[PDB]
Amino acid sequence: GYKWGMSIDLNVCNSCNACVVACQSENNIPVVGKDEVWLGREMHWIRIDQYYVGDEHTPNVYNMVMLCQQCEHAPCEIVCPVAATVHDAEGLNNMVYNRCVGTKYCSNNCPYKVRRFNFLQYQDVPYRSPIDASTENDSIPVLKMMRNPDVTVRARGVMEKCTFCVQRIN
């Protein structure tokens, strides 16, 4: 059934980063502060990778836009203790944000390190520093409308990944 697959053409990926925001506008991906991006905790299910091959004065630069490959033999699934991230009969790794107890092992088994983890309460982060907890359950009422009404707004301690936009497949 439906064997959901994707075919990226890196010949034409000019790193416009429009796919990085399109996954944010669609999947309710939370902004992270600069203090926590320098710690390598950016929530970006899809990322473009410059690679700068040779001759550091005049290097050719190539992009491999990296997202969750939805591996059929997904190594990030055999490693979830509570069985949150499982595969699909349609053929794409299902991240279930609610069964995720935040073990965060799945990223360590993920060969591509696509899975991003809601380490702190990443929500309204430029409007509330995530290193607090007095307001981590209080949401900005104006921001609640830009969120997609069919993608889970992840709490803290819940891993996420590029789900092939199940909100559009379902």
Binding region for ligand F3S (CB under 6 A): 79-82, 84-85, 100-106, 159
- Candidates 15-23, 97-105, 127-135, 137-145; binding stretch for ligand SF4 (CB under 6 A): 15-23
> 127 vs 30, 114, 134, 138, 169, CA distance in Å?
11, 26, 13, 12, 32
CA distance 42 to 21: 13
Closer to another protein by Cβ: residue 73 or 142: 73
The DSSP symbol for 59 reads: -
* Residue 70 near ligand SF4 by CB under 6 A: yes
Q: Which of 23, 48, 84, 125 binds ligand SF4 (CB under 6 A)?
A: 48
Q: Which of 5, 59, 75, 126 binds ligand SF4 (CB under 6 A)?
A: 75
Gyration radius of the chain over CA positions: 17
Q: Which of 18, 53, 61, 89 binds ligand SF4 (CB under 6 A)?
A: 18
* Residue 155 near ligand HEC by CB under 6 A: no
The distance between the two most distant Cα atoms of the chain, rounded to a whole number of Å, is 51
The upper half-sphere exposure of residue 139, i.e. CA atoms within 13 Å in the direction of its Cβ, equals: 13
Any known ligand binding at 51? no
CA distance 167 to 60: 37
Please enumerate, by residue number, every residue annotated as part of a binding site for [3Fe-4S] cluster. Answer: 80, 100-101, 103, 105-106
**Residues lying near ligand HEC in the complex (CB under 6 A):** 83-84, 86, 96, 98-99, 170
